[PDB]
Amino acid sequence: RPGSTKRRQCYPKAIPECLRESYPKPDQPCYLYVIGMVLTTPLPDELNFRRRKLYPPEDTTRCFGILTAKPIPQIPHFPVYTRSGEVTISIELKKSGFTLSQQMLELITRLHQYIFSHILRLEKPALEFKPTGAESAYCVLPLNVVNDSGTLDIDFKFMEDIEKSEARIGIPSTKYSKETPFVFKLEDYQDAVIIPRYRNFDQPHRFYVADVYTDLTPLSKFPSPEYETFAEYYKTKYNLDLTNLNQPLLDVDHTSSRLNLLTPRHLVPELCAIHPIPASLWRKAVCLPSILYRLHCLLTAEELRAQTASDAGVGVRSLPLGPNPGLILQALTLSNASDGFNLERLEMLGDSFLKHAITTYLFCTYPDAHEGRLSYMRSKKVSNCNLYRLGKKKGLPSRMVVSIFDPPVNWLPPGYVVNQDLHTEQCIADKSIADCVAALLGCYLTSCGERAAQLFLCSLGLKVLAEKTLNHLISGFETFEKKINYRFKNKAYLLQAFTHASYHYNTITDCYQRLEFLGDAILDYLITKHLYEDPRQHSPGVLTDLRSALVNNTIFASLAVKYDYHKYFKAVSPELFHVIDDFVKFQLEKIEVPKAMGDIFASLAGAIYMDSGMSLEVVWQVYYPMMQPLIEKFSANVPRSPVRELLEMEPETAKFSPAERTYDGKVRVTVEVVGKGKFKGVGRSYRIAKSAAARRALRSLKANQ
RNA sequence: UAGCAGCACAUAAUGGUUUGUGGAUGUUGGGUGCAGGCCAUACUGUGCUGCCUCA
């Protein structure tokens, strides 16, 4: 069915408008952004398994910039988890409206290719570098501080120095002899990336210089147990005799192959070529895939924020408000993506508000439609099928984050195309598109409030926007008004709330059932909002359990008895009065629960809502003090089924019999607890019977402990 | 800068199970649809490893 988990569809991935076709043209105005990088949380030495020097990216004058033909909007700063620790990223406009020559742009584009293909090794046989034909068409370039002024600019000199360098295309062929011996220069290695010249010619392993040992030489002990000395190693493995046996040695670390950094995890110089790119900048280069991916994700979320501010009138189109893009990115992120956050909390809050908004809308729009009809219409509008259609129509599927980020497998680098797919497409379930709509509703509710959430629903396409007889029938309700600490402006709502359909003496209001319908959705929403806002910050699963336990007709009947509602209840059914009296007796001492007692509890919420001028707050002021002891009790001790509690205590030893239908239509169930006895329960249903059996067993087990 | 094999978690797939829920031929409740919680087979990713390439 449409809106089911069992139905899956493929969608193309959205690329933000500001990155699409964004290739700088010769002699045309362009934008230069700086990637600001600050080490905000250093990694503990215990997790730094080599105890290597942490490198704050900010300690170094060279960085990267983004060159684009289109402006990038402000996005929240975001963390990236490097081997140094948590680095906060800023994307800052440095220059706007400047021009580049064909030669300058070619130099940038060649270096940009060189980064993704040669440095990062993200060019694969399935990928082609076509910067003018690529959908995501921006260049990344080196920036440096000009003349120690602190001012960053395009380091054209460094790009040209890379182009003149023979070390760009492969390993330099410069062999040292006794006539031209190797001379070590310390300055050339302090921030170097090096390439060993004697091995792995197709895939030269690159290393950072981590340190320079001035106390160690080629005649010193080798790190592999296979060779005694560095000189012996190079002679034995590659037939290379060293010209300078007194040169210092380099302590080296591999260049990182891990390019997903969005979450926390928890040699002889003479035989090396210097790669023209410094190690500081190369450490920054390794972050580019995660940075550009995160940038892409946040830009997609901001595009959706700005679109919703246009379509719904909710927020401001450009910020100097609407939700933070990080919360939209949360509502777009499935738990499968593993990104440290997910939509599930926002979804549940959204669902509760959605019910309320539609219920209120239906109640007010259809003043003559009875409860069962409003309930039926409600059930169709809130369906996963309808919500999927709305989410598809809004173009959410292309914007969702579905899978775990993996640069070489599912990410297309800027200026590349796919040779005709995990790079360009994603497969999504119809239900997940429905769940995302509710999470977005929860995002707009939490950030912008209830009116803004209603306008958001309207933007999706959901339409969400006698007296003597009265005084006689309400006689004595002044004591009830005092008990609930609320006084009605219009006592007809109070009468309606306490009028059963059997109570034909009321000819001046309807029965309670319409106000019951309205009150049900109000109480669900208010309780859910309160549970979501709870300082304990309950998990998605626990929120579901608490919502289920608190939003219940049995609890509402129990409260209605505790707050004397049964004394004001207007009915003409002796049988209903007996069932109520038996339940009232059982509740006063601490058996069928009379539905009508929970229904009038909801109906009075509906009454107060209408009498207060649609004030949810006034309802909550009345109901919160009544419910608080239960909200505290269940939020302290998240509730359980007695059958589940028995199965948790006795998983292999507790076996339940089949349902035996007794002669009175009632179900009987036996639970056998191996070695501990057989306990029978009876009730009108298998669970009242199985729960009664499980409670008798649990009582016996707890008594024998 | 590589491959593989164990163990933790996330995750979709095919089966079952269980709570909720719906109009239904509804002879007095087993037909199907969508959600949660579990049990089983099987996939990927990250991580704790283990063996094993180059150094």
Author numbering: 501 to 766, 795 to 848, 1052 to 1151, 1305 to 1349, 1411 to 1535, 1558 to 1672
Provide the authors' original text about this structure.
Vertebrate genomes carry a single highly conserved Dicer (Dicer-1) gene (Jia et al., 2017), which encodes a ∼220 kDa multidomain protein that appears dedicated to the miRNA pathway. Cryoelectron microscopy (cryo-EM) of human Dicer revealed a protein architecture that resembles the letter “L,” with a complex helicase domain at the base, tandem RNase III domains in the core, and Piwi/Argonaute/Zwille (PAZ)-platform domains at the cap (Lau et al., 2009, 2012; Taylor et al., 2013; Liu et al., 2018). During miRNA biogenesis, the PAZ domain, which has a strong affinity for substrates with blunt-ends or short 3′ protruding overhangs (Lingel et al., 2003; Song et al., 2003; Yan et al., 2003), binds the base of a pre-miRNA stem loop and the two RNase III domains function as catalytic “half sites,” each cleaving one strand of the double-stranded substrate (Zhang et al., 2004). The helicase domain, which has a clamp-like architecture of the RIG-I family of RNA helicases (Fairman-Williams et al., 2010), is located near RNase III domains and is composed of three globular subdomains: an N-terminal DExD/H subdomain (HEL1), which is separated by an insertion subdomain (HEL2i) from a helicase superfamily C-terminal subdomain (HEL2).
To understand the structural mechanism by which DicerO can support both RNAi and miRNA pathways, we used cryo-EM to analyze this murine Dicer isoform in its apo form and in complex with a miRNA precursor. Although the structure of DicerO in the apo form could not be determined due to its inherent flexibility, we were able to determine the 6.2-Å-resolution cryo-EM structure of DicerO in complex with pre-miR-15a. Importantly, our DicerO-RNA structure captured DicerO exclusively in a cleavage-competent state. The overall structure of the DicerO•pre-miR-15a complex shows that the helicase and DUF283 domains had faint densities in the cryo-EM data and could not be built into the model. A control experiment showed that DicerO on the grid was intact suggesting that the weak and missing protein density is due to their inherent flexibility in the cleavage state. In the cleavage-competent state, the PAZ-Platform cassette anchors the 3′ and 5′ ends of the pre-miR-15a and the RNA is accommodated in the positively charged groove formed by the RNase IIIa/b domains. The dsRBD of Dicer interacts with the RNA using its α-helical face and contacts the minor and major grooves of the pre-miRNA, whereas the β1-β2 loop binds to the terminal loop of the pre-miRNA. The dsRBD clamps the RNA in the catalytic sites of Dicer and the alignment of the RNA with the catalytic sites suggests that mouse DicerO cleaves pre-miR-15a between bases G22 and G23 and between bases G37 and C38, producing a 22-nt miRNA duplex. We conclude that DicerO without HEL1 exists in an open state that allows direct loading of precursors for both RNAi and miRNA pathways.
